[PDB]
Symmetry: C2
Subunit: 294 residues, 2 copies
């Protein structure tokens, strides 16, 4: 309950022109996060294009990320799967890998019940020693993991927290009153992450931190200390970026922002992600400028 | 396109108590659909638990269904994937297999743009000779394939129809006026499928047909002939089943129904799907009795 707080980047998976992971650029990003104060790196989350890496590529990107990090910054592996046997199998790949934990999303597309969610996350945690951070994002999955079910799973030993990406701020204290104090509450919605922290959230798993890592680390530090008017100044500088980094499907805008700041060699993605549009480039550039990054 | 019309069953993948496919129950189901007038079998769609079979088991079930069908009834392979490379690769498995076409869902979870949807399905259609039926189901995918994008994709040689599962009946003629007249329009929502046909759709890819194949075949035949008042009498008989087969997540209720009618040996599913509740059993039973099947 400290490395899973603060500003945690959901790091993009930088690719070359063929759509394969670019170690050189990945190394650049990781050095940037070590130097910026990022608390940890979620490797192959949604923003890392988990949807279009097969599980072998997924494991490889994580291991590459661990190697480049070289102990300087903790790495959390994205391990979600909508089939419980496959989530178990992906998780087991990382046992004794060096990752400090997992981010495991509610099963998508097949829309299980709350009882199905509970059985899913329990079975996964029973097959590993790693801390588990639950991840709820109904807008992507078709499925809402509710506070009561969260409270049930938080009783599991190595289920330690949740990346709450509904953007519904009432969930913060709904979950918190049902879980112990060391259960970590993490925003998955950049635009409302400060609010989320002002209500008691412990940090954010952030897309914006890919291109404003220092700002995001300072904002989360101020929030944790109770300096919310001061945190709010930074948030207002970053807010157009919190919004426009989703003006087209994530991570299309944030990869283009990364390329624009020099952080990666190419903004290539894998289909069905498509190159950013002309209007999107103008919109994201204006938000980067608004942030004082460009 | 006559085989892509009428009552098409999205058939369950029956399993033994360990969750492996049960060939003897699959044979039972396929003979039932041959005797019932079902027009075609969609193999390993959503109701066939596509989410929890890997592509090898997936391919096994399709090949097993084709074999058992023995040329008596056409088979459509479910082939959707949220990574375009993976959708192509899965579609390539079934070329020259004997399936008559493919049911391919919009990418789930990664929420592509309409242009992302266009590139995805275009790329797929260009790597096969098989007819392609698009599948829109935003409730599960987080993504909504709009009529104009369907108009764009129908211009593609082998993109030949859609399984429209929004339950929004205005889509029927919104799509119809953008496409050729042999573009097949198929309901993906049992409770509104007759309305869908009365508005001009050509049939349904149906969950209810798993347990009421004769009535569904008769209702669709009546609808195609314009006898909607008589088709509606059957619909009113089946409507509690249209609704209660989703009282718990599909295909949990329909698999239990199949067992109750003695159509399959077990109603076992794979996690994160869980067994039907007692309250689910009573609700699904009463709906079956309402239909005169029990």
């Amino acid at each position: 309950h400290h490395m899973f707080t603060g500003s945690i980047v959901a790091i993009v998976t930088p690719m070359d022109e063929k759509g394969n992971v670019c170690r050189a650029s990945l190394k650049k990003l990781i050095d940037y996060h070590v130097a910026s104060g990022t608390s940890a790196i979620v490797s192959v989350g949604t923003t890392g294009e988990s949807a279009t890496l097969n599980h072998d590529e997924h494991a490889d990107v994580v291991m590459m990320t661990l190697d480049l990090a070289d102990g300087r910054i903790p790495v959390i592996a994205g391990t979600g799967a909508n089939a419980t046997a496959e989530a178990i199998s992906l998780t087991q790949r990382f046992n004794d890998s060096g990752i400090v934990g997992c981010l495991t999303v509610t099963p998508y597309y097949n829309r299980p019940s709350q009882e199905g969610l509970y059985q899913h996350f329990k079975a996964i945690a029973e097959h590993t020693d790693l801390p588990q951070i639950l991840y709820n994002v109904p807008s992507r999955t078709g499925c809402d993991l509710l506070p009561e079910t969260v409270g049930r799973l938080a009783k599991v030993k190595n289920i330690i927290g949740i990346x709450e990406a509904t953007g519904n701020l009432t969930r913060v204290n709904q979950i918190k009153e049902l879980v112990s104090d060391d259960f970590v509450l993490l925003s998955g919605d950049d635009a409302s992450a400060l609010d989320f922290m002002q209500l008691g959230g412990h940090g954010v798993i952030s897309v914006t931190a890919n291109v404003a890592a220092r700002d995001m680390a300072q904002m989360c530090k101020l929030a944790a200390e109770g300096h919310f008017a001061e945190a709010r100044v930074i948030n207002q500088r970053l807010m157009p970026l919190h919004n426009k980094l989703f003006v087209e499907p994530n991570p299309i805008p944030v990869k283009w922002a990364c390329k624009e700041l020099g952080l990666v060699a190419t903004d290539t993605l894998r289909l069905p992600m498509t190159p950013i549009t002309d209007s999107g480039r103008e919109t994201v550039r204006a938000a980067l400028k608004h942030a004082g990054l460009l």
